[PDB]
Design a protein around this nucleic acid. Sequence first.
RNA 1: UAGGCCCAGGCUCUGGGCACUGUCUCAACGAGAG
RNA 2: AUGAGUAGCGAAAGAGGGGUGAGAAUCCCCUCCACCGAAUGCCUAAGGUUUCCUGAGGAAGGCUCGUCCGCUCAGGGUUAGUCGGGACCUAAGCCGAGGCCGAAAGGCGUAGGCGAUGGACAACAGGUUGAUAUUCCUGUACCACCUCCUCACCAUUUGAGCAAUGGGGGGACGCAGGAGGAUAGGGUAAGCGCGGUAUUGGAUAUCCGCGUCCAAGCAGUUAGGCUGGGAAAUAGGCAAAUCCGUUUCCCAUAAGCCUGAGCUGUGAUGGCGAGCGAAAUAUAGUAGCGAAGUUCCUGAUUCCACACUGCCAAGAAAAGCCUCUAGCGAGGUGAGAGGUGCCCGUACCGCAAACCGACACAGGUAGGCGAGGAGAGAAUCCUAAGGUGAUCGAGAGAACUCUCGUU
RNA 3: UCUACCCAUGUCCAGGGUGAAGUUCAGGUAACACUGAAUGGAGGCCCGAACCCACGCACGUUAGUGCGGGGAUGAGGU
RNA 4: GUGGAUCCUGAGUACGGCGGAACAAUUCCGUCGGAAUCCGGGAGGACCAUCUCCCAAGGCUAAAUACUCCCUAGU
RNA 5: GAGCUGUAAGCAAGCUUUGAUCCGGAGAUUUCCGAAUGGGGAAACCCACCACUCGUAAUGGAGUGGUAUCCAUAUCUGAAUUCAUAGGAUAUGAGAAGGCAGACCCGGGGAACUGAAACAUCUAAGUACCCGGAGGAAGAGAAAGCAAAUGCGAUUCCCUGAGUAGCGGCGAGCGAAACGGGAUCAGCCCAAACCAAGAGGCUUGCCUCUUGGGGUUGUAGGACACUCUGUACGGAGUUACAAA
Lengths: 44, 93, 195
Amino acid sequence: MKRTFQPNNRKRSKVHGFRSRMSSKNGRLVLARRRRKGRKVLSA
Amino acid sequence: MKDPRDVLKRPVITERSADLMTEKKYTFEVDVRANKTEVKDAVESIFGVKVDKVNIMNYKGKSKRVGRYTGMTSRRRKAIVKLTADSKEIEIF
Amino acid sequence: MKVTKSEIVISAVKPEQYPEGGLPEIALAGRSNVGKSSFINSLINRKNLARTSSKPGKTQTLNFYIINDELHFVDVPGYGFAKVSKSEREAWGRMIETYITTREELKAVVQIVDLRHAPSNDDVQMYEFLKYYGIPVIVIATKADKIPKGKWDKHAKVVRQTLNIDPEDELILFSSETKKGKDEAWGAIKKMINR
RNA sequence: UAGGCCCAGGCUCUGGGCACUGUCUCAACGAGAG
RNA sequence: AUGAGUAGCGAAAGAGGGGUGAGAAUCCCCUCCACCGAAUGCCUAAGGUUUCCUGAGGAAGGCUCGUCCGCUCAGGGUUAGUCGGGACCUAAGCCGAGGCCGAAAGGCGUAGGCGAUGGACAACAGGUUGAUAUUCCUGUACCACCUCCUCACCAUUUGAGCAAUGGGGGGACGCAGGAGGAUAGGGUAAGCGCGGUAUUGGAUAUCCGCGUCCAAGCAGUUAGGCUGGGAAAUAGGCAAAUCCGUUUCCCAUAAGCCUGAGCUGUGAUGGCGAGCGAAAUAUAGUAGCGAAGUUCCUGAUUCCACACUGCCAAGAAAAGCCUCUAGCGAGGUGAGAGGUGCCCGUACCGCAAACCGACACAGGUAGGCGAGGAGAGAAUCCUAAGGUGAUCGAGAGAACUCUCGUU
RNA sequence: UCUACCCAUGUCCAGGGUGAAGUUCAGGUAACACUGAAUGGAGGCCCGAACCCACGCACGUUAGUGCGGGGAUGAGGU
RNA sequence: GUGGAUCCUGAGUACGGCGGAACAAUUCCGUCGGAAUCCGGGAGGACCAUCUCCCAAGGCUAAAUACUCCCUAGU
RNA sequence: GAGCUGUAAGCAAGCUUUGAUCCGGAGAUUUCCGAAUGGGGAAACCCACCACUCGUAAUGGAGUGGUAUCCAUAUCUGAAUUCAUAGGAUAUGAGAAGGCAGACCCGGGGAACUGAAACAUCUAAGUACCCGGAGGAAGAGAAAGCAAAUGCGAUUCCCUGAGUAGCGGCGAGCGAAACGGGAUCAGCCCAAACCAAGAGGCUUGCCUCUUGGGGUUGUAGGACACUCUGUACGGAGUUACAAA
């Protein structure tokens, strides 16, 4: 029950994906900021 | 699975299903995490029949709308059980 | 022998751009697709510092590499077919020959040949050129991992015969793929720098 | 559907001659779209 | 609001009869006409994500209309041991224990792991529904694994067997050029079943349509490469080795070896097949029935096969595989017979109105097949199978603009 | 995920012409030269489809679209 | 409580040089050094003496203060 | 204490005075991802090993637990070195791993524009920002002090001193402290020197190792030697004042 964008582009997920965001302190900062704003969608 | 009655959810009653039922094939809605052998054994236990073959599909959810709001229906797992020359699951339809 | 610092100084196509400092220098030579840009990488325990490829003509300038700040490594384009315009194929040869004829800091030249086959005409017409200007030469036979172990001594004999290598200069069997003969090459380079 | 020829020199350039033509003397009619 | 009922509304071929309906140029059917045809045809990717089928619908949307739609709404629809991916392998690249250079943030980097666009690996022909079809049904196969079983043949730590993380081999690869052998394919003669024309004339060497078939396994065959073949010594290849080397002889000119496209019988008393053809079925029209089914010519852009010759730039790697002993070893090998075989994708569009881009199109979109005549040709013109008539019209035929023709 | 350059692994290029080196044959040259044949099939070779081109040149209009020109076995395209 | 015969009261520290740091100079850090210790020391801008206060190189302590993503009652 | 099955329709079928719906306290269940931790990974998914159980003649299938790294404590062994040691293995660990409240506070690093009408320092500013550590508060804390008195006596915060002293191309500007008035109000413990016990080198002695008494101080105190005084019926306390 969601919306998916390019569910086959692997490079999209390897650049802007959740596991790449969680692999460095700066990406975790990005995720923290987006959680603070209240975004419905975190990362790709 | 723990109890086989958790593998089978409900039968499917359509025109295609009624057509297949005359070839001794029965269509069930199945728990989305159950595999072929699980369904085979559950049908064995519940109805006391002999099972020859099982085939399974996966179905995506459909987009629906009621007024302004939009959503999706649940995913489904469908199984077509072919019995051998044995008894007949009485679905009492 | 224990490289701990390595970087590229400058890529040059003219004598003006040649670096300065008086450090000893070692040059490379060979065919276009023989593994000389990877010989450097294997010596200094680096992966793709001198970029390599399986398409002939990856190195197109003169690249200088400082090794632990005592010497330079010179990467040159190779001769033969080069997957580039015919006009630019002879500019590389002229650029290389001018640098070799000049540049007192040039200690010795490492010429790399393919062990699998007998050296081409160009390899001999480069060995003669280096022996005629009186520059010490170290001959390296790379890609020794493509040959069964029991034929190295057979192929090396043909390599020596075709290039008519003078008894003095040794032939080190090398492999940038299994790091074979690395210490011997270092030792030879060290000897050639001081002596 | 599908290259204009010939005689020159200079290495592609300048040529020259011929052929040919609505480029024009000078425009007229016809077909289509607006 | 004005500009203004103005500019637009793009190619490109339609015409009539019938139907439905409140309403028809535009929707459905029929008929003729016209356009593409190295595609505007067939299949199948990437990508999209229900757009697919049936019934209903006339808000909105669709450069006009609309009874129609890729639009709206309700129900439905996707079946795998063999197809593709994972319980297999590695490339570029990524993560990179320990480790090194660091005062440090850091930088470099090995073992290892991940990672297809490549390598390994078992199924074919028909039929069927409104929507799935090497998945369902029929008929014939194959692969891996397991014994309640049945046989056969061996062997008892004298030994039958199993055999490596080690040794050797192999997987294993480019381009160009020219012979050869076949087959897909394309056209004559037999044969089959229709016909005999009303516009002058044809029982006529007249006209029309048709003229086949899998994987599997039992054969034999082009051709190709040969490693020349054997014996010893050999032990070298870290241990070992009967394996691979390496020497020494002997015979070798054809023995042997390893690979082969295709053809013949079997699969098949099966299927398909021109054309006949109901009940009436819910009057679509199918259900159902079914003839001959060959030889000849020509022939590849496909296969043998990167096989041969020439060239240098030498056109991945690893696993699966085959061997050799080291080693394990009292119970085992080979046949049947009976069983087991999971997860993910599977609808639909794929030169397109489903994708991409969109001045909104007449654009773009890996790959496989790609017929005939005239032709060197996949050019060009007209056609086959097949698809389509492209989405505002009617009619007038001034100036002027653009594209053509003639002088 | 545009664009510049680069890496690994796949894949595409209808047809026609030209004729290099070498080899054989002879003549011929002391012999090479050469001569003539025959064979041979090389090339950022020629003509030209598919394909490619910040190559002009329009157009209508923010990148496009068309009309010439060029390459088209290679410094080739994808 | 009386005494005070005899021991203790916080080691490379207190202080000095050596450089930068910082910037007679000022301190920080390193870079070398290097005492005393009750009759003992440290201070009162420097030094030299008088007087005045204190006892370094061990550790632990609430309260008064700062702010509120939140919860309750209100303005 | 009489209706109820949320929004929120409808349309069915039901529950409830033998007491529902509802409100509050305490519990139970709690799929998958996520620090995510069995391995891998494009987060919401794939693929495993061990033990026990279900099931099959057996293979195949299913269920329930365990399986990351680092640190600590041990236990063994134990590369270099024999022991030892690196290590390995084994165990025991509600250990720590991440989040946030865009606030408050400790520590480390640390701009530039601007202004000085220009620019020489300076100012902006130890600000923005980044990194590490936390706690409900936090460093701060009981004088080798202020200072000059008839002296006060820990720390912190507010008023005043004062936009003064002072520092300043002494220009822009920056900018104190003490006294006085208030809020809150408590100060303690160890080491050292001495006594008692055991051992471990040393020859007894000696001398350090530990454990119990000892003692917290500056117009010096303690040890030490000797006096009274006690070991309770009194005092203190988990908020420092040992501890509970």
